[PDB]
Design an enzyme around this catalytic site. Structure first.
Site, PDB file in Angstrom:
ATOM      1  N   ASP A 206     -11.549   8.716 -22.092  1.00  0.00           N
ATOM      2  CA  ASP A 206     -10.869   7.961 -21.609  1.00  0.00           C
ATOM      3  C   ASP A 206     -10.435   6.258 -22.845  1.00  0.00           C
ATOM      4  OD1 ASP A 206     -11.054   4.556 -21.585  1.00  0.00           O
ATOM      5  OD2 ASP A 206     -12.998   5.152 -20.393  1.00  0.00           O
TER       6      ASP A 206
ATOM      7  N   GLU B 115       0.622  -1.107  -0.085  1.00  0.00           N
ATOM      8  CA  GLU B 115       0.004  -0.031   0.090  1.00  0.00           C
ATOM      9  C   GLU B 115       0.693   1.420  -0.194  1.00  0.00           C
ATOM     10  OE1 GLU B 115      -2.517  -1.792   3.023  1.00  0.00           O
ATOM     11  OE2 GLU B 115      -4.304  -0.886   2.262  1.00  0.00           O
TER      12      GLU B 115
ATOM     13  N   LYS C 114      -7.002  -4.114 -23.777  1.00  0.00           N
ATOM     14  CA  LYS C 114      -7.348  -4.277 -25.061  1.00  0.00           C
ATOM     15  C   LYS C 114      -6.446  -4.179 -25.967  1.00  0.00           C
ATOM     16  CE  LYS C 114     -11.790  -1.762 -23.352  1.00  0.00           C
ATOM     17  NZ  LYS C 114     -11.534  -2.100 -22.319  1.00  0.00           N
TER      18      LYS C 114
END
Ligand SMILES: Cc1n[nH]c2c1[C@](c1cc(C#CCCCO)cc(CO)c1)(C(C)C)C(C#N)=C(N)O2
Ligand SMILES: Cc1n[nH]c2c1[C@](c1cc(C#CCCCO)cc(CO)c1)(C(C)C)C(C#N)=C(N)O2
Ligand SMILES: Cc1ncc(COP(=O)(O)O)c(CN[C@@H](CO)C(=O)O)c1O
Ligand SMILES: Cc1ncc(COP(=O)(O)O)c(CN[C@@H](CO)C(=O)O)c1O
Lengths: 410, 411
Positions: free
Chosen positions: B196, B52, B225
């Site tokens: 986007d 984290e 993608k």
């Protein structure tokens, strides 16, 4: 071979492999997943888009991916007794996000465990979506006993009239009494959410009371005591909440699920259904109590609440002239990994802290028994008492080397 | 092996999915085949590390080498796209978009985004999604006759509604997106601009689509993608103040521990995309798509939305054939061709029946299909959809599919 194309990346990964072998990982939230879990995450399931739920996807071609996701759902219902399960949350944080969406409205009053007292950031922190989106009021632990005072929680509930009470913790070593939380929730007309992320493996083994029959919604991660891949899960016994949970996860806050990670959840859940998992979890707790017995009798390592019922402990190091950040630093220098951690009624910065958190799931997975956990606690004590005596820090380094070599990884 | 015998249920399902991927034509525009190296990074012991925080500013120790990996992902991303700052922790495109909005606007603010039927993503303002629930989204679409974005309508809408933010980017839009026009409309009304690029990210990285990073306040993307990486998200910006808000929004804002084995996979894939051969792949993606659109334009009944493509995908309105998009999906899947049903501009059917199917070439291109193979795919699709029950025709298509997949095996 493909490592020839990107030698920098594969070099870092090899060094990390060696770091995990040569250090004692005492981070209470970590573990070592099986070869099978890692192979599932390394599978070609990463290539499949599978938005929606099994039998009602928005893409073609999911008929075999649906077997994987059904296996994960159905093994979760078998492990925890929930009538409904959702295995798509990418993380504990996404699981808790969707659980809130299914239970309350923005701005609603929610009672959750204070961070210093041991709650998680997603149980109401102002820097987290939880505190930004809802009106959180914290409960904590008693200042003297450092355990939850259920009558103080009750008083808080009636004062604030919360729509939702959240139970569960990142740094609480004692048994959480879900029956009492449900009692209190009922008195004020609130719903109950339990986040069992840390104790889910113990719950699965029957070694911590199961919150699922008490809570409207139970959330969890799959990667702590459950020993699965990193990800989240949501459980419920209420068909109406199940539908809201499913819509909240998708299309509410996620898109495509990570079906390769979900396959590792299915793998880890069958591992947890094997009788050997109960023995593993039994050993986690025995190792943790053994370790707490060493700290209780050492000079200057005060165990928060004086005991543990589960896999973890918090150590107050104020008596030693150091803060938690310095303690974490000392122990890293001798190959012992912990995290600085706030303690109840913490007076220092959350990035300084007065303590460290220790847990036993990872070393127990390596094969440590009671005698080996005692040895670890003694090396930890020795290193923090060695006020920088180089002779002693080097003995400790050797004790660690001795332990890692006796218990190598696969 | 030994763990496959412990759990035949799970491992036999994965084996069947490996065969399906080998034996089907995967025409889903948002899918790809990642490399062996990406899969090996995702299958690595990095899954065991809690990390984290951010490189060099973690909340606890043990992150020396995790930090090298994540800085490789960050630095290759900055190189690939020309951004001064990158965040590689988002678990997904949806999380990337959540954090970007958190860095740009306040709850209830007015946002302009692409309508779903017109090709926008669910996170671009759908009321069933956090975006439409949390902000006041005003949709722009495409023109009914040309089925491309009308930039004067966007300007009109922006001037009328005074949005705090304009969102550009699409899930089912086959034409070039003019990011300069969007930057201009945003400035005219004082709005911020978010892009986007999930679908076109690989094409941008190859220089075959205009780059949004210089025009957008924040650019978000997925890694899986046309970029051909693992499933995840990422956020880019050139503004240091925004980069801080972005980092805080991702963690501790909306996420906890990052998936560092996936982030390793992102580093592996970004270096693959930096290789000159990625440009030829990306060029072949577009040439294959254009070759398919030509076949579909000649066939009666497979109407290509807007009549052309500039990128990797096309939308086919199938209603002239007497079917809807759901029936077409199911017909094609029964001959081993995988698409998704998809709403078309001004959709009149339920969003779960739809009038169209969406087809993209990134996956078959990765398998090695060239333009003549893409032509054969489009011909098989036309034949399957015109066959109307005729099993002789459908089995013909099935044989063509097996011919193509045997010519272009995986791995
Ligand atoms: C992460 C995390 N998530 N949830 C958590 C944590 C813990 C945590 C929190 C913060 C913070 C902060 C303010 C917000 C930043 O701007 C700092 C540290 C160490 O420096 C550790 C540890 C990891 C368990 C923790 C504690 N103490 C509790 N109880 O739960
Ligand atoms: C998922 C997803 N996320 N983003 C997306 C999608 C698409 C999608 C959405 C829905 C829906 C819904 C609720 C609508 C409010 O009632 C149904 C389908 C097919 O059944 C397909 C496909 C996958 C690309 C899509 C379309 N068409 C658009 N343009 O973008
Ligand atoms: C009770 C609980 N619920 C949710 C989460 C978040 O899970 P995530 O990191 O997968 O988002 C945690 C993480 N717990 C981490 C801190 O993020 C830990 O070291 O304990 C948690 O303890
Ligand atoms: C432009 C854009 N931005 C964001 C996302 C969401 O990414 P995620 O599925 O990883 O959450 C998508 C997903 N695209 C999916 C639909 O969810 C698809 O098949 O096209 C996207 O197309």
């Amino acid at each position: 071979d493909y490592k020839t194309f990107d030698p920098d990346l594969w070099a870092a990964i090899a060094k990390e492999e060696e770091r995990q072998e040569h250090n004692l990982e005492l981070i209470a939230s970590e573990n070592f997943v099986s070869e099978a879990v890692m192979a599932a995450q390394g599978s070609i399931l990463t290539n499949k888009y599978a938005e929606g739920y099994p039998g009602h996807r928005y893409y073609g071609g999911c008929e075999f991916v649906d077997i994987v996701e059904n296996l994960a759902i159905d093994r979760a219902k078998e492990l925890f007794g929930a009538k409904f399960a959702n295995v798509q949350p990418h993380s504990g944080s996404q699981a808790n996000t969707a659980a809130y969406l299914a239970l309350v409205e923005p701005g609603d009053t929610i009672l959750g465990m204070d961070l210093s007292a041991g709650g998680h950031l997603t149980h109401g922190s102002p820097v987290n979506f939880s505190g930004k989106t809802y009106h959180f009021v914290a409960y904590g632990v008693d200042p003297t006993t450092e355990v939850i005072d259920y009558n103080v929680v009750r008083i808080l509930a009636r004062k604030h009239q919360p729509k939702l009470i959240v139970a569960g913790a990142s740094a609480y070593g004692r048994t959480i009494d879900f029956a009492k939380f449900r009692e209190i929730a009922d008195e004020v007309g609130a719903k109950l959410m339990v986040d069992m992320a840390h104790i889910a493996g113990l719950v699965a083994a029957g070694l911590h009371p199961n919150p699922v029959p008490y809570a409207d919604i139970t959330t969890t991660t799959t990667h702590k005591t459950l020993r699965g891949p990193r990800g989240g899960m949501i459980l419920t016994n209420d068909e109406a909440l199940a539908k809201k949970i499913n819509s909240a996860v998708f299309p509410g806050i996620q898109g495509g699920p990570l079906e390769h990670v979900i396959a590792g959840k299915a793998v880890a859940f069958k591992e947890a259904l094997d009788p050997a998992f109960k023995e593993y979890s039994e050993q986690i707790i025995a190792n943790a109590k053994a370790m707490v017995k060493v700290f209780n009798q050492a000079i200057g390592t005060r165990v928060i609440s004086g005991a543990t019922d589960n896999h973890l402990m918090l150590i107050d190091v104020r008596e030693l002239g150091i803060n938690g950040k310095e303690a974490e630093s000392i122990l890293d220098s001798v190959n012992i990994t912990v995290n600085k951690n706030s303690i109840p009624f913490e007076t220092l910065s959350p990035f300084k802290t007065s303590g460290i958190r220790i847990g036993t799931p990872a070393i127990t997975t390596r094969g440590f028994k009671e005698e080996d956990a005692v040895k670890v606690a003694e090396l930890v004590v020795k290193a923090l008492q060695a006020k920088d005596d180089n002779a002693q820090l080097d003995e400790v380094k050797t004790g660690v080397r001795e332990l890692t070599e006796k218990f190598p990884l696969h």
